[model samples]
Target: AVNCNEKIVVLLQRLKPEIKDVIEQLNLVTTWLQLQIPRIEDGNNFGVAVQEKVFELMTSLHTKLEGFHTQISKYFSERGDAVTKAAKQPHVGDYRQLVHELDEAEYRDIRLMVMEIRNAYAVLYDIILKNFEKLKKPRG
Candidate 1:
């Protein structure tokens, strides 16, 4: 039983660092995105609207990602040990298992959210690059 709990603990520990890395990287990108808001100097009304929406999406995603980070951190601090024991024992194990399951579910949700954010950034980047290319072209 002890061995089982310890193994679960080790597995959870391994996962924790990965989550931390994602949180850190996401935060850095969020900062870059926020900085990008001011640089939309030359664009049409449509471009202006898209850039504003991109900023809004970035802000929303940032908040959700931060919330996920907080949730995961709380899971580790509060239920990590409980999960290990629950992994071994039948009684009271259901609750612990559920907690771990919820953590995993949130992790998956964040993964999807990250994909959405990446796609949004890509769209904004493509628009900016296209506008720049147009600017560089010779006019009659």
Candidate 2:
């Protein structure tokens, strides 16, 4: 049983590189979207493309992150390592402490990286949606 878990442990260790690739790809798309912000003021046609790209990048990142989560669940099932995350809160010390723990964790830091990617996407998605809405509103 220990050997089986250890084998998967080595495989799990390789996941960091996969997750890194997701981050780099998503950053490339985000930088492209950022470049469109200036054009959005002029009601550009490619604004839709920017939005679509954001969604695509987010979806891609999310799918890969879910795979990471599934692998984690499997490891936990085999009693390899514990997996848990605290719900981030506005004014909770425990939340901050939890984040600190995750940040300093060697192998578990991959999960924190996944959370950062998801949160960045959430922010970019909202900003783009708001920009499109503003573009559609007529000037006074």
Candidate 3:
């Protein structure tokens, strides 16, 4: 039982790198979207609509990532040493259950954010790709 819960903590630890990569990818896409912002003001309604959608999705992704940050910070501060501490104490009681639940929640929250960012990026990427040539031309 102890080993099982310990493994859960290790698994949760592994997610940090994955979550970090997701954040980096989201940032890269966000930069790309920002670069196209100036072109959106060139009076194309379709372009403006796409920009609005992209911003809406980006806002949601950021909002959820912020929530994830809060949850992860609390989880680390409160349960960071749970497994190791459990080793010293014979009866960690239901605290293990609480840690496991927090890990589960954090994992799900991050996964949702990853999906939202990827889906949003796909839409924005395709739109930008389609218009790359047009976007590069000087407006009269």
Candidate 4:
């Protein structure tokens, strides 16, 4: 029972790096979109529509990803504390306690965070990719 949960515990711990990369990649998109703002500024309706869409996404995604980033950071720190305190105990049961607690985090926060990340990604891609040509249009 413990070993099975142990794998889940480790799985949750490993998710942070990939989440960090997602944040980084989105940051790049936001910044690059800002750069493209000038070229696309000549202002056609379709371009304006796409511009607003991108801008809206830029704002929301910053807020969106920061929430995830904060969640992961909070969990990781508390998780470290949980293990450190668990390690000081002088019993096999203490380690198993840590495993179960981490398992709960895996099932709860990790699941929600993973799902939300995908949701954010799909919205971002669906809007941006479909409007990409509109964004590049400099003339009405």
Lowest lDDT sum, 10 consecutive residues, model 2, at 78-87
- Which pairs of residues collide in candidate 1? none
Q: What is the TM-score of each candidate against the true structure?
A: 0.43, 0.37, 0.55, 0.65
Q: What TM-score would candidate 4 get against the native?
A: 0.65
Query: Which TM-score value belongs to model 1?
Result: 0.43
Ranking by lDDT: 4, 3, 1, 2
Better of 1 and 4 by lDDT: 4
lDDT per residue (tens digit) for residues 42-86 in model 3: 365565555556667666666555555466566666565675565
lDDT of 2 by residue, 1-140 (tens): 12233443565576656666666666666565555444345555555554655557566665655565465654454332222223334455565464445334534645565566567567655755766553332221
- Cα-based lDDT at residue 59, candidate 1: 66
Screening candidate 2 with a backbone cut-off below 3 angstroms (N, C-alpha, C), the clashing residue pairs are none
Candidate 1 ranges beyond 4 A from true positions: 1-4, 39-43, 76-140
Cα lDDT, all candidates: 0.54, 0.52, 0.60, 0.68
Error of 4 at 83 (Å): 9.1
Q: For residue 133, what is the lDDT in candidate 2?
A: 51
Question: Backbone clashes in each candidate structure, one number apiece?
Answer: 0, 0, 0, 0
Question: How well does model 3 score by local distance difference test?
Answer: 0.60
Q: Looking at candidate 2, what is the lDDT of residue 40?
A: 43
Q: In terms of lDDT, which candidate is strongest? A: 4
